[PDB]
Amino acid sequence: KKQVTDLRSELLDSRFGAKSISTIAESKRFPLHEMRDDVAFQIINDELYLDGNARQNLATFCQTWDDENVHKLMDLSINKNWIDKEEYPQSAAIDLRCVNMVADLWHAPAPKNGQAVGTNTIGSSEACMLGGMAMKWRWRKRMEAAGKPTDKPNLVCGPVQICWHKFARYWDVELREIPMRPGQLFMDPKRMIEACDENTIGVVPTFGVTYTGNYEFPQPLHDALDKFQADTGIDIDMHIDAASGGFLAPFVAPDIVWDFRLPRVKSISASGHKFGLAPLGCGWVIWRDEEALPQELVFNVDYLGGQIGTFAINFSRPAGQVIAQYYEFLRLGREGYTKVQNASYQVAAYLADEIAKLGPYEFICTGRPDEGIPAVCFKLKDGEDPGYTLYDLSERLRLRGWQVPAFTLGGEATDIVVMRIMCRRGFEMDFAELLLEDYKASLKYLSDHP
Amino acid sequence: KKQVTDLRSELLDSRFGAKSISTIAESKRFPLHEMRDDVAFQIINDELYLDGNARQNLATFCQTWDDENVHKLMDLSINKNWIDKEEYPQSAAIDLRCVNMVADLWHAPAPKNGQAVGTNTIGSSEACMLGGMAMKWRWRKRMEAAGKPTDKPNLVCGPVQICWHKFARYWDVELREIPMRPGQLFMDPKRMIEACDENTIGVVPTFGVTYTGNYEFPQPLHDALDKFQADTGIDIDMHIDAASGGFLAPFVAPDIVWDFRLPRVKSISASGHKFGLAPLGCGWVIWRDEEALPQELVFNVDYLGGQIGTFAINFSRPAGQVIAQYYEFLRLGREGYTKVQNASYQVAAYLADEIAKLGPYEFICTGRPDEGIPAVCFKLKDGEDPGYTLYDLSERLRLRGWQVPAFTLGGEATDIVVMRIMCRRGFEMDFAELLLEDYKASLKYLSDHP
Amino acid sequence: KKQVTDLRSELLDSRFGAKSISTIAESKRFPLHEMRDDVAFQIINDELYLDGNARQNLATFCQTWDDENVHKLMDLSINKNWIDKEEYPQSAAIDLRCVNMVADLWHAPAPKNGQAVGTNTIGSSEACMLGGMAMKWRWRKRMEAAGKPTDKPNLVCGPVQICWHKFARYWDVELREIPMRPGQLFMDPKRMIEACDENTIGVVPTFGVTYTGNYEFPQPLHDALDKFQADTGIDIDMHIDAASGGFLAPFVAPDIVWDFRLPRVKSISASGHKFGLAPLGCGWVIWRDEEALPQELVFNVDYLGGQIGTFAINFSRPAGQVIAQYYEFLRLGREGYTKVQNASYQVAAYLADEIAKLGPYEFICTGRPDEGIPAVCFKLKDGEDPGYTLYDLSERLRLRGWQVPAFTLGGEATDIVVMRIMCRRGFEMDFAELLLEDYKASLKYLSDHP
Amino acid sequence: KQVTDLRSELLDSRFGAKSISTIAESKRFPLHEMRDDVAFQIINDELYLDGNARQNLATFCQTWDDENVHKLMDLSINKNWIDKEEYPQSAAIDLRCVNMVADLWHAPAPKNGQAVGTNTIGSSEACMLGGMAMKWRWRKRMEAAGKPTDKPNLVCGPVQICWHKFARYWDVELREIPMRPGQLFMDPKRMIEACDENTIGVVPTFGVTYTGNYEFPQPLHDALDKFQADTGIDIDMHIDAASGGFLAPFVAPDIVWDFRLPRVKSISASGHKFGLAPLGCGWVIWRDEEALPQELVFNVDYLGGQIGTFAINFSRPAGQVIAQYYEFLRLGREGYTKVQNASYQVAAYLADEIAKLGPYEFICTGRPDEGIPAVCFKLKDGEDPGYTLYDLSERLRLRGWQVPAFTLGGEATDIVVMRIMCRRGFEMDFAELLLEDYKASLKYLSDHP
């Protein structure tokens, strides 16, 4: 009799009065029985409230808002496999159009066969790894042509994102990172060259440093590499990590020469899901030409009577993000992207100007299109003590749901603590003004409770 | 006033009467201006009709259907970044629970500290690469402990999926793939041993061969490695590529000893988005214990007052797939997965039995849970010419929307042409009956057209 | 021409690239012009993120979750006017049914004419004011019957909610609120009698004290009032403020005699939107019989050829909440309400037990259905200093989005600080465990920072 | 049998189910839980017995809301208006509205940047708040003069029922000037005749419900000025602008009815009437801090500070105020003017067309300078077209229209009038359908006794 009465309750009980929702969710072993689908969904939906409100997460560089058409395109493509070119041929075609468009945006030389050399990825990490492998292979071929050993490769870079550290570790390459230091939180030409030698597989400038938000300019570095070859005969290539800058500079600062306009730039990577406005799960890596991508790294697959070259670390994955990316390209175009990015810079500039009035801060990034990305980065003026640290301010802001990271820089600037505010699409002026209000209140509090 | 007149039309024109929809979509350069969002969506939505219907794609192993709750969870998580453990802490916690559940499902030794060693990935490709890197590292340590050189590593395997070829290429490991041959379309104990030597970083049995759908049983191979170490002193580990098998056997054939129950198995990988029932973009790799995973490959990140180890190639990416995976685990449990997988095997078995009476066929896979995955694989009997090849049949079926692949096997069986039908969730008996009807019709046509 | 180009942009610009979203929302003067409706919605939608997550708000007693059918009924009733009985006659009829059901739930004498004496209200506040006006009127009639003056009315009560202070102020009644004091945080029989006199219009027990979560039991007070009349000839009525308790005890503690089973109780009020499970905007007040409600306070209106009595402060208002309330009565019934409330009590008891293990606490409320509502209320043991105050704990929990109030009691217990956690529908066990985890984490932090 | 019935409970269709084979409970709390789809279906269905809101021409309240308001309301279904610290932005948004409405009514610019006023569930609560403040200011005046305060009275014209309730609930003698032939409102002469030192204030109705016409505060204000000059008695006003408050500012700005008038200490209006907000939104604004007795305000902590609160209700939905703010930003003066102009155009059209159909005498014809967008008429005195307006109202109801016909009060109880309200959502084309049914109804009433 109990079984039937229990089952009756299973059918009729409300979501929160149900027996199945009276226990803590499994966290150690694979569940034994099936359960009400509404209760399973409810529990998980509710647990996710413990994640931070994405729109208030001012620490991330990734998109936290997508328009309705992208939501639809994503749902519609939830089961389209990006890797199966023959099974989802139009998704594949759309992908190839994006490759052309991004290559064009970065001034890659026009492809004679009508198709640029490059590929979509899950993000900049995979894109960078692909660029790094190609870089390492081109170096090997150069050394082999010279009759020199290829067992001690190194890579020269500045304050790179962690993915390059993983590349170095995973592909056994010695990472030679020029450390940040007071006065120059980036890789300068002089220190770059001092780290270069015949075993350097390449140099990686970060066109939009994550820690500060400022651009490392490839041109001055390119000049130094030209002189290095003239003096030593050593020819070093560049791969630009433009995770953020790749989808900013072309629109608001087109005259900064950082891309394929520079001879030594053999490849560039960027995150479509950062300022490229695509939903999480989209990255891009373009090569200046076929010569820049070693064929031994490319796996060809049948496609519409012919073949297409593939270079990826991942295999199966959703094609929704690239479809969404194409949508943004067509819907916004240069005009639309410029308007959206200009909106972010205006917000960044506004906040930097207003926050400067509230305390003894020294700004590292103030939302200037010509210097970096739409971000605000600052620190307390040396020797100044307003009665609080940027860590305390970060915490107070969190009480209102905002995630504004405060952290120490690296290298020779480990004693410097900075606060960074990322101004992405969806962080409109009105919304940013609310942050400003909370910022003033927080300081107000820290003042009444020193 | 033509500018005012064009604008009026731009505002009032219907979807297909609009001037902006009168041209072919851009495919070579980045668009210059923005356009109506409905038109951009319509064009792309319509182009996607050229992709094959996913529900009729019987070539793929990946999920082509997800329940409504998964669609909701995915939409809700479109902007949750899997990599930001501190910003989306509960998404991170849910992921850690799945790691424990998958490890438990595969009989991994119980975690003393309550947390299994493993990670979520975009798919089995990344999971296999993580497993391979760890294998390579353990091998180098083993060689180094005996003062031996580590410049000639090789990996022994059978008819593996392409990701293993990419692993060998990207990490400079010699792939010793034992080829399929008549009467033996798998890596057998004897040939495996012939291929193994002091430079073998490990053996990778494929617990669910893509080309045939059959399991390569680790147990017999394991006994062979034990004897190998006894005779030569060479101790070789195994990594199971259970992309499909990992979420099948545990439910429908629990007595098959293929997992951590086997001492030499140091890691196992599988695709959540294949038989794990997760939406595209979910993979898993678990290690036996801490000793199985070299700490040098792990990058720790801050997490709730402590630190969490991370081992991944990708960085930013959506957390929706793992959240959906946890939902399936809780909603279905062993009971639910058993019922779902059983339905797939029932369909495969049905098709195999029905197709067998329509022609002179020899089956390689008939949907037997004790032999492999829910698939049907067959070829024309040796020396039989029914007046058509399986290529013709595959083509006829495509006229009704079905994608049923016909292909030649590799290795020393390149003369053999086989047809494979994958029976996934969402390919119910009634739907399969329709395929059967189209099969009978196709054969009649081929008959009336020798 | 500039106007044409501006118009083109107003039409084609994306949500965040639009000019109209580049400024701060008006807050001082009525706007002059119209603007894109999507921008207006976006700005407001985004500002609301600054409100606390209702599901994590553990301070409120009101519903923070409604099932899909309620969301539908509310949307369908958004334009139905509760006050227009003749224009929306069935909404009116449904409302009258709820009056009957609530009256019956509280053991009101069965209405001979089939319709209980009572009315729906926006909340307990209006309900309490209606009950208060009626009490005042009956008192005046009693005094007048003996030829005595009615210029000095007073109301006797314990730690009441603010609405009674407002009633006293708005209707010129001296509020004799018996203060909380160490050992008895409630109105006890002895002090109640001390405060009562010929000028007392009635006694108001709070069946579910907001500050502690405990019930003030009407029966012992009723016994005292009986003896009081016997000793002094002064006959005093009771009005039970059962804002919370009215939809709890009837289901989980039917043996508690607090309602119309007690002769002196002439009216009872409760919040439908608290434990009554109705969405915000629903309250109830029921009178014992016609004699308990002075007709001079009732305004009759035409209804279906007859007349219905109305007693309300508000006039026009949505009928969705009462329609939703009826749906909950029908869908859940006594069985459903019992299970939902049982779930809340289960959660309160769990947290009480677990939190007790974390520090030197003295509990005031532990979620016992025989003592009060599903709440947890505690203070630090007298003389114990764990290194932090409950205010500190409340603040740290807020860093995770939780709103757990810490406050000082009133009256003679102003030096006592307590923390109160409300366990409502939608605060399931699994969700509560997450809170407990943050509680443990918050304590560890407070210890690591003496 | 247990298992048998359970199987049916799981598989039965909505209408084949056992639980829907009986009449819904109406006497006692149901005992058992039941299928949620059946419970919903039953209620959804009996609600069809309510009149179609879009065809309800008797109500002044909104019967249509745009998609964004529907969304905002669903999103705010659980946001508690009263918990200022818990839903701080909802509260902030509310305060912006207070400023905007105060500005709309020419309230003196607040030096501290925040107007004195509050959102309410409707005009009823707003009027009661204004009434209490009015009563308290009067008490303070009498106490200063050293006179008794036990006999307060309130002077008004044909007020809505809420003022009768205020009078009863707060023990104030209501001195209502009755309507009479040719004067369906409170005129200056009769107002003054009812005023004395016990009058707590005067309440002009800027948009009389029964007729749709405005009672103009200016001439009444002039009479009160003269009254003080003559007697020394200083009487203030509270304008009940339930309807007019969100009409005149947009279509007839030159009418001086608001804070431009010195004696107007407070004004109330229904956001859910012509303010275009969904049901459950009212407003009351005071001209300054001095007009609102502090003894009536309960301060609550708010963002490190305190905010004064004056309300009868406590917990309630914040959706309506959020929706109200959306309309303010989305429409602005331009938008409201366009929306209100549309209603007046429809009211004027119907008045003109209905005039051609019978011997009617119009009381209201949708003129922006005279009142709200309504049509009100009666049969010419001594004229008998063979039917009453009651019969006409009934026949229109056969098509789903609710067009009320009723008798006026006071000295005009023998007068029967019909009133048509033209709100947002009663577009020209829709109104033309009503006109077609009106013509048909008359034609029918003609071929019959």
Ligand SMILES: *Cc1c(COP(=O)(O)O)cnc(C)c1O
């Ligand atoms: C499909 C498959 C893979 C690749 O897994 P993804 O999820 O597509 O990256 C690897 N191994 C085997 C045996 C497979 O079937």
Ligand SMILES: *Cc1c(COP(=O)(O)O)cnc(C)c1O
């Ligand atoms: C964010 C970032 C990355 C990693 O890109 P993903 O899209 O997260 O994989 C790499 N480099 C830089 C400079 C970045 O900012």
Ligand SMILES: *Cc1c(COP(=O)(O)O)cnc(C)c1O
């Ligand atoms: C919450 C509460 C009230 C006020 O009820 P509302 O529904 O918010 O108006 C009154 N009394 C008690 C005891 C309460 O808890």
Ligand SMILES: *Cc1c(COP(=O)(O)O)cnc(C)c1O
């Ligand atoms: C409708 C009305 C009221 C009552 O306002 P509610 O919003 O329904 O509470 C008061 N006065 C007048 C003049 C009205 O028209």
